[PDB]
């Protein structure tokens, strides 16, 4: 149910929030 | 910030790196503003490291126009639960500017207006208040620049 692609996304992102902040 | 100049700038930023499109247009040479130049540059760096840490992008999306709009709101509702925040907002735009370029790769160019404006919608209607009460783009230009 829940969207592969989309925690794929959100991982990453997660890392530039934490990198940058 | 205008939201539609914004995204039309990235995507073409990326269909240009891409080679799927040279000239004039959104995405041509240097970006207008320091806004734009940051989101190119973050951008340049987020997909890099994706591809690194699982594998191409472009390449695990399976495009028809019929699922398209479908399946970009799926995507895009996981990669936001929790909240936004500024590394999942330019998750947000490779992510959208990569069903661009797969689009064009499978020969169904017409998507990329409809992703633009499905960006934009998503923009405006999930993500805009968030956006403003962090601060707005200067923010994100300012943290990210």
Not at chain 1, 1 to 21: K, N, S, V, Y
Not at chain 2, 12 to 22: I, P
Not at chain 2, 69 to 85: C, Y
């Amino acid at each position: 149910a829940a969207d592969p692609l989309g925690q794929a996304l959100r991982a990453i992102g997660d890392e530039f929030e934490t990198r940058f902040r | 910030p205008d939201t539609r100049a914004l995204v039309a700038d990235f995507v073409g930023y990326k269909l240009r790196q891409k080679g799927y499109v040279s000239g004039a247009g959104p995405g041509e040479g240097p970006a207008a503003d320091p806004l734009g130049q940051a989101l190119r540059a973050i951008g340049d760096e987020f997909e890099t490291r994706f591809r690194r840490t699982f594998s191409d992008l472009a390449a695990q999306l399976h495009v028809t126009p019929g699922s398209a709009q479908q399946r970009f709101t799926q995507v895009s509702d996981e990669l936001f639960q929790g909240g936004p925040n500024w590394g999942r907002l330019v998750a947000f735009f490779v992510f959208g500017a990569a069903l661009c370029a797969e689009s064009v790769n499978k020969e169904m160019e017409p998507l990329v207006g409809q992703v633009q404006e499905w960006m934009v919608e998503y923009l405006e209607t999930r993500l805009a208040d968030w956006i403003h009460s962090s601060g707005g783009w200067a923010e994100f230009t300012a943290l990210y620049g």
